[PDB]
Amino acid sequence: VLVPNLNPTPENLEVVGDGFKITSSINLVGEEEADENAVNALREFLTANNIEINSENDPNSTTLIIGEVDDDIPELDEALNGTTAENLKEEGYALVSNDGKIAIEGKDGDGTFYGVQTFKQLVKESNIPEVNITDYPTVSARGIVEGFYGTPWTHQDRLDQIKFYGENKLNTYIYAPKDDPYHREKWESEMQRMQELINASAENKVDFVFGISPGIDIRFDGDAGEEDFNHLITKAESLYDMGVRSFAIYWDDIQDKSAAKHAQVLNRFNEEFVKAKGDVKPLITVPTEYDTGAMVSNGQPRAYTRIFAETVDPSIEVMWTGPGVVTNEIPLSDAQLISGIYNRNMAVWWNYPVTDYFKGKLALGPMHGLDKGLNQYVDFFTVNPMEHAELSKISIHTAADYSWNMDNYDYDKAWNRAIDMLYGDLAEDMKVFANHSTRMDNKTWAKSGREDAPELRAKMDELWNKLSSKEDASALIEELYGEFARMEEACNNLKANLPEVALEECSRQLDELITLAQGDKASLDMIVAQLNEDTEAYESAKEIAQNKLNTALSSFAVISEKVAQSFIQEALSFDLTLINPRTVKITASSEETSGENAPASFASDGDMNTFWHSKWSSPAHEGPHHLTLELDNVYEINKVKYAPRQDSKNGRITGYKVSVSLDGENFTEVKTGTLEDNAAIKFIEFDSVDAKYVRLDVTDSVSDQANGRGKFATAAEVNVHG
């Protein structure tokens, strides 16, 4: 048997044997001395997979040994054979399965728990492979930061997430926001709701962090003043009695922008609580300026960050989002900049998959853009999730592999492992849907994540290239039709089979991708209709394709803007029939550069605003004027579009003489005529004919220059069609 899909990926793993089958009843060794929470997770796993534990010793059955380095078990070390956990760092484990004996050794209590979750992933229908493993995390504090606007998570969503973190090896969870009666507002009747969260966090080796956001109405001056300050600590002390070992004070929105007053609250709280108890974990906080753009300028730091960094105690943890609030990448250079200001290892608030800024689109991509050496300056990782809790698991899954094993991380593969595991048989169909909903961008200040459906985008671009170059795309068109049908097939089967927990969060988004897919089908119909010269079917398909986009742009759900949605819009703006540049080598009789930058290049530029002008500066070239367009390859053409200078009358072509050629030296003729004097774009139409050089000899032009008739020649755009 082979190694199943693991998460996170262990540091060291090697296939020593083939594999063995697990017996229906086994015997466990080392329950009493081992971690209590680590065995509880293992005991129920055996119950769920129909496995029982023997009361007395049995040589016929398989033996599962578990414990710590602290514990002195002669059975465990013998089953290890040259393998130890003492050489590993905190929260590390060492798993070894060989010849009906599975030994697991952790460094401490936390480490042994993560050894149990690897055993659960290796076992597939009671068939565990034979491999030796030595493993340890790259980041110490890995987890989630619940801080999204809108409707908060429910209690059953939270409890489900706690268990999900432990199995995928994550040890942090921050409460807040949002509008709890106690956190911001008024910071027995609601004791249980918070109590159940802490007890479950202890069972899954996760440090429960309590958040506080008093910024909007906190006071610094006065008695009270001290009274508010005294009334800070007691709020936390109640939770310390409930079992909370981590606390935090947030400044994410404050307005009252005084770093000396914010640090005063943090620093004295660091003395009167976390060091005063001896129980407590280090203090966590978020300054008012958290993004590098708002933090530094430009850069050495702004007025706020200078005072804040130089006041706050080095022991305190500080969170920052990156180059931006919702930014694409976090390069190591940015990490060096922020960490240099604070002179400590910073904590990260990664805003993905959080969709509180762009609620329409879902975020189902991996950890994209983060530098692989981020563990150097950062030893505290947290992500901001979506308000949709079930689907937030896919990105969090990728967060586990990044934070734990950073140097070997691969975002594309870790993404595929997230969907394969969380869905099972229904993974491949979900992959197609999630593939289109990864790139977050509100077309302004927020953008992050992996690009949507790139493979499909390259092919879409490949279609417009081969359409605008005479080339036959029958093979590519056939594949596209199938690709858009695969989208509609996957989205429907998902709708017929998803657990509501998931279905209710993405029901509108499944209907959206289908509407786009159908539009993409209707888009190819137009392209086929243009190649077959079936204008009736073209307009009929155009009727459908336009409606799908209109219903898509009206519908609340948003998905695959760049790829699936934009493909419909491109098929509507495609002429073509143009070819179209650009492409190639426009040349002219005379051009202006000295007086104004308007050379012959701007004649076939594509930009409607830019124009070409004949040489009017002294010594001026007063015609006869002519444009000569070089074609990329020979093309059949039956229409020459002329867009005259819009802003000015100077040099409008009111008389032309178009010629064609295949060598560039010997031109012929195709049409001679005049054009009505105005700013309207003229279409010169003649019979289809192959050509590699398109000439436009000007026989008449006008201008507002007294006796400037025929002295000048200006063209905003000149290009051929066929």
Q: Detail the residues annotated as belonging to a binding site.
A: 147, 178, 252, 290, 349-351, 356, 384
Whichever of 105 and 130 has its CB closer to Ca ion, that residue is: 105
* Closest by Cα among 338, 147, 171 to 248: 147
Cβ–Cβ < 8 Å for 693, 554: no
Minimal distance, residue 32 CB to Ca ion, in Å: 9
Instruction: Tell me the window of 117-125, 409-417, 541-549, 553-561 that interacts with Ca ion (CB under 5 A).
Output: 553-561
Using CB under 5 A, pick the residue from 128, 212, 558, 637 that binds Ca ion. Answer: 558
Whichever of 522 and 715 has its CB closer to Ca ion, that residue is: 715
CA distances from 359 to 125, 183, 508, 558 (A): 40, 24, 12, 9
Using CB under 5 A, pick the residue from 577, 610, 661, 699 that binds Ca ion. Answer: 610
DSSP character at residue 473: -
Please tell me which residue in 253, 472, 647, 690 is annotated as part of the active site: 253
Cα of first residue to Cα of last residue in the chain, in angstroms, is: 61
DSSP character at residue 450: P
Dmax over CA atoms of the chain, in Å, equals 115
Q: How far apart are CA 308 and CA 303, in angstroms?
A: 9
Cβ–Cβ < 8 Å for 464, 378: no
Whichever of 68 and 390 has its CB closer to Ca ion, that residue is: 68
Q: How far apart are CA 438 and CA 459, in angstroms?
A: 19
Minimal distance, residue 600 CB to Ca ion, in Å: 10
The answer to whether residue 253 is catalytic is yes
Q: How far apart are CA 207 and CA 244, in angstroms?
A: 8
Whichever of 530 and 601 has its CB closer to Ca ion, that residue is: 601
Instruction: Tell me the window of 67-75, 236-244, 293-301, 375-383 that interacts with Ca ion (CB under 5 A).
Output: 67-75
Minimal distance, residue 417 CB to Ca ion, in Å: 30
Cβ–Cβ < 8 Å for 173, 201: yes
Instruction: Tell me the window of 230-238, 276-284, 598-606, 706-714 that interacts with Ca ion (CB under 5 A).
Output: 598-606
Instruction: Tell me the window of 60-68, 198-206, 480-488, 525-533 that interacts with Ca ion (CB under 5 A).
Output: 60-68
605 contacts Ca ion (rule: CB under 5 A): yes
Number of H helices, E strands in the chain: 19, 27
Residues present in the chain in total: 722
Give the pairing of strands 172-174 and 207-210.
parallel
Q: How far apart are CA 527 and CA 542, in angstroms?
A: 10
Quote the distance between the C-alpha of residue 673 and its chain's center: 56
By CB atoms closer than 10 A (0-12, 13-18, 19+), residue 260 is: exposed
Using CB under 5 A, pick the residue from 602, 616, 635, 642 that binds Ca ion. Answer: 602
Residue 318: strand, helix, or coil: strand
Percentages of the chain per state (helix, strand, coil), in multiples of 5: 35, 20, 40
Whichever of 108 and 157 has its CB closer to Ca ion, that residue is: 108
Minimal distance, residue 458 CB to Ca ion, in Å: 24
Residue 250: strand, helix, or coil: strand
Whichever of 335 and 715 has its CB closer to Ca ion, that residue is: 715
120-159 residues near Ca ion, rule: CB under 5 A: none
Burial code (b: 16+ CB inside 10 Å, e: under 16) for 372-402 equals: eebbebbbbbbbbbbbbbbbbbbbbbbbbbb
Residue stretches of the annotated binding site for a protein: 147, 178, 252, 290, 349-351, 356, 384
Q: How far apart are CA 664 and CA 583, in angstroms?
A: 16
For residue 113, what is the enclosing H or E element?
Answer: helix 109-122
Q: Give the interface size with Ca ion as a residue count (CB under 5 A).
A: 9
Whichever of 557 and 637 has its CB closer to Ca ion, that residue is: 557
Using CB under 5 A, pick the residue from 51, 68, 421, 631 that binds Ca ion. Answer: 68
Whichever of 110 and 390 has its CB closer to Ca ion, that residue is: 110
Residues of the chain immediately before an interruption (C to N > 2.5 Å)? 187
701-720 residues near Ca ion, rule: CB under 5 A: 717
Whichever of 401 and 605 has its CB closer to Ca ion, that residue is: 605
Q: How far apart are CA 644 and CA 658, in angstroms?
A: 16
Torsion of CA 234, 240, 241, 243, to 10 degrees: 160
Give the pairing of strands 246-250 and 207-210.
parallel
Q: Phi, psi (5° rounding) for residue 307?
A: -70, -40
Residue 592: strand, helix, or coil: strand
Instruction: Tell me the window of 24-32, 193-201, 537-545, 557-565 that interacts with Ca ion (CB under 5 A).
Output: 557-565
Catalytic residues: 253
Site residues, Ca ion (CB under 5 A): 68, 70, 555, 558, 602, 605, 607, 610, 717
